[PDB]
Amino acid sequence: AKGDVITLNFETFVDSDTQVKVTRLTPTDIICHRNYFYQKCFTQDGKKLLFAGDFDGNRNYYLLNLETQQAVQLTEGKGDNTFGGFISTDERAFFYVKNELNLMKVDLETLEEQVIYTVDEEWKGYGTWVANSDCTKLVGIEILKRDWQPLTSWEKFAEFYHTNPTCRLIKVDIETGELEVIHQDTAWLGHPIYRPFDDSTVGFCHEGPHDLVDARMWLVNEDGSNVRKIKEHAEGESCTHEFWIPDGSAMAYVSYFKGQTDRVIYKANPETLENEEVMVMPPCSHLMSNFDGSLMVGDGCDANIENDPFLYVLNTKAKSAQKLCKHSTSWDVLDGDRQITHPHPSFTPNDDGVLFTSDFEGVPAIYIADVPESYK
Ligand SMILES: [Mn+2]
């Protein structure tokens, strides 16, 4: 029940291949996972952590006190989207979506909840809400209910893309609760993201197969004008995994050229709109950077070869990737949920560690791998 407290045991072990220290935060007998890597889950001091677990028979949100090893239940009941959740800039509250209908704001102190927005009967919420740096406005996208189709299989994926569904990129005001359509279109839109310290810019993209798609690297101003593509897109080049670097210095992404058998990370200037290569990309699924983009972490995955179960800590400046420790996750889909099993590596607020999920000990749990100065 909302408000309850649970005392956890932190067990630290040494990785057999890198000697790097790794500590498990959650029990090995109950399902737990971290939120999406681009969403804030750590307080600046690095003492509080937001995460999800089934302690109360339901996938709910908890706030873990790293120095007390005690976690308090933030939300109760069923219907929580345990991935999109995030902590406010003032760290006095976190936001999450319940029943895919109501955007909630929760006081981390009183645990009081406030529904700040409720999707209209005409639309369907899609993607994850992303707050602006000041945490006064939220951006997101929605799909016209009539145009909505359940994406069951890949056959249904491409199918939906061609149905050219009408989607809109909206902006909601935390204070007023009023929505403002900043961009609409009869195309499948997605992944809306406010430019870190610049409410002016809002990056979004076109969903669908990376092949039969014009381009996904899109940008548009808050007012709704200057809709443009981040990169010109070279014939044969596919871009993905885009994400704003925390400080807002640039839009980092990964591109792959057919016939080059090599993936390379790229940084795009939000203002100059000029892209530039940064370094190679080891075989990884997700990619997240440091605050300034000087460090990056990656998810080793599957390509007589061999599946890569390692986490990578890339050094932007030195342009060098290095194996940190091992996550050894079974990318299995639990109860239709394909994301709980994803490591979703993210740096700790001061870069001394990397938080990630894994089910190698049997069930999905949360770990924090230390990150030595040599970036081992
Ligand atoms: Mn993922």
Token pair of 257 as six digits: 């050229």
Centroid of ligand 1 to alpha carbon of 189 (angstroms)? 18
* Structure tokens that stand for 327 in this block: 């996550």
Task: Work out how many domains the chain is built from and give that number.
Answer: 1
User: Ligand 1 centroid to 37 CA: how many Å?
Assistant: 8
Is 160 strand, coil or helix? helix
Distance CA 154, CA 211 (A): 14
112 CB-contact burial (10 Å; exposed 0-12 / middle 13-18 / buried 19+):
exposed
8 Å CB contact between 306 and 328: no
- Say what the resolution is, in angstroms: 2.6
Domain housing 248:
1-376
**In the 8-state DSSP scheme, what is residue 239?**
E
Is 114 known to sit in a ligand binding site? no
On the 0-12 / 13-18 / 19+ scale of CB atoms within 10 A, 314 is: buried
What CA–CA distance (Å, rounded) separates 30 from 6? 13
Chain breaks in the chain (C to N over 2.5 A) after: 303
Rounded Cα distance, 376 and 370, in Å = 9
Question: Which two three-digit tokens encode residue 270?
Answer: 């939000």
What single letter denotes the amino acid at residue 285?
Answer: S
344 CA distance to ligand 1 middle (Å): 6
Look up residue 288 and give its two tokens.
């997240």
The secondary structure of residue 147, as a DSSP letter, is G
Residue 246 tokens, joined: 């925390």
What is the CA(96)–ligand 1 centre distance, in A? 18
Distance CA 294, CA 347 (A): 12
Q: How far is CA 47 from CA 44, 67, 68, 84, 98, in A?
A: 8, 6, 9, 21, 26
Ligand 1 centre from 223 Cα, in Å?
A: 31
Residue 286 CA to ligand 1 centre (angstroms): 6
Instruction: Using the CB atoms, write b or e for 169-182: b if 16+ within 10 Å.
Output: bbbbebeeeebeeb
Distance CA 348, CA 48 (A): 11
Long-range contacts of 360-364 (CB under 8 A, 24+ apart): 360/327, 360/328, 360/329, 360/330, 361/24, 361/28, 362/28, 363/28, 363/29, 363/30, 363/31, 364/31, 364/32, 364/33, 364/334, 364/340
Please tell me whether residue 374 adopts helix, strand or coil conformation. Answer: coil
- 356, 340 in Cβ contact below 8 A? no
CA dihedral 83, 138, 40, 299 (to 10 degrees): 50
Residue 162 assigned as binding residue = no
SS3 of residue 265 by DSSP: strand
339 is in an annotated binding site: yes
Q: How many angstroms separate the alpha carbon of residue 241 from the centre of ligand 1?
A: 10
CA of 83 from ligand 1 middle (Å) equals 10
Cα 285 to Cα 282: distance, rounded to the nearest angstrom: 9
Q: Do 117 and 172 form a contact (C-beta atoms < 8 A)?
A: yes
Contact 127, 113 (CB under 8 A): no
19 known ligand binder: no
Query: In the structure encoding, which two tokens stand for residue 203, read together?
Result: 């990056």
Length of the chain: 376
Residue 122 CA, distance from chain mean position: 27
Structure-token pair, residue 238 = 């596919």
- The Cα 352–Cα 10 span in angstroms is 17
Q: List, in order, residues 6 or more apart from 207 with CB less than 8 Å away.
A: 161, 188, 189, 190, 191, 216
> What is the 310 CA–ligand 1 centroid distance (Å)?
15
Cβ density class 194-231: b for 16+ within 10 Å, e for less: bbbebbebbbbbbbbeeeebebbbbbbbbeeeeeebbb
Instruction: Tell me, in angstroms, the distance from the centre of ligand 1 to residue 127's CA.
Output: 13
Q: What is the CATH number of the domain that holds 212?
A: 2.130.10.10
Q: Which residues of 277-308 are buried (b: 16+ CB within 10 A; e: fewer)?
A: ebbebbbbbbbbbbeebebbbbbbbeeeeeeb
